[PDB]
Amino acid sequence: KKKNYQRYPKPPYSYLAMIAMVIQNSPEKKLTLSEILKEISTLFPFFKGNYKGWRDSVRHNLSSYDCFVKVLKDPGKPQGKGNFWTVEVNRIPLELLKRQNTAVSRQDETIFAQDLAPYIFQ
DNA sequence: AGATTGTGTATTGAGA
DNA sequence: TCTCAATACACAATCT
Ligand SMILES: [K+]
């Protein structure tokens, strides 16, 4: 059967950039997946909408990109879940922090910062 | 026990 | 035309 697929009018930043920004601006520079999902939802009204598949995309990003590093909730449970996630900025591909040229940014360029690197790198 | 997490697999389509 | 971030679903294993 044909696979379902749709592109959504998501914010014009990569999921990587948005995740990295919420982690880096958290008090301990670490967040669980549950906490990341909550904080991402604060960034833009799109994430308060009824499309929820971005939550899966965020999970995907944490595993897929090497810049996201799991920190064990319990050091004696290396197979435990609900761990913290950190960002290693030296592993981030810099261009993935730039504002994306999508229909969403073209609709109103001036409400979107051109680069999130200033809010990620110290 | 279903919800959640972490990762594997795979397809998609707009920017470049 | 082509890349890869976006998106979708499987599945094992933990979590509550
Ligand atoms: K990772």
Descriptive account of the structure:
This protein is of the alpha+beta class and 122 residues long. Strands 1-3-2 form a three-stranded antiparallel β-sheet. Helices cover 30% and strands 8% of the residues. The chain has a single domain (15-119), classed as Winged helix-like DNA-binding domain superfamily/Winged helix DNA-binding domain (Arc Repressor Mutant, subunit A). It is built from four helices and three strands, in the order αβααββα. Helix 1 crosses helix 2 (33-43). Bound molecules: potassium ion. Residues 62-63, 65-66, 68 line the site of potassium ion. The chain binds a DNA duplex (16 and 16 nucleotides) through residues 3-8, 10, 14-16, 32-34, 53-54, 56-57, 59-64, 70, 77, 79-83, 96, 100-103. It is classed as dna binding protein. The entry lists the keywords transcription factor, DNA binding protein. The assembly is trimeric. The entry is titled "Crystal structure of the zebrafish FoxH1 bound to the TGTGTATT site". The protein: Forkhead box protein H1. Organism: Danio rerio.
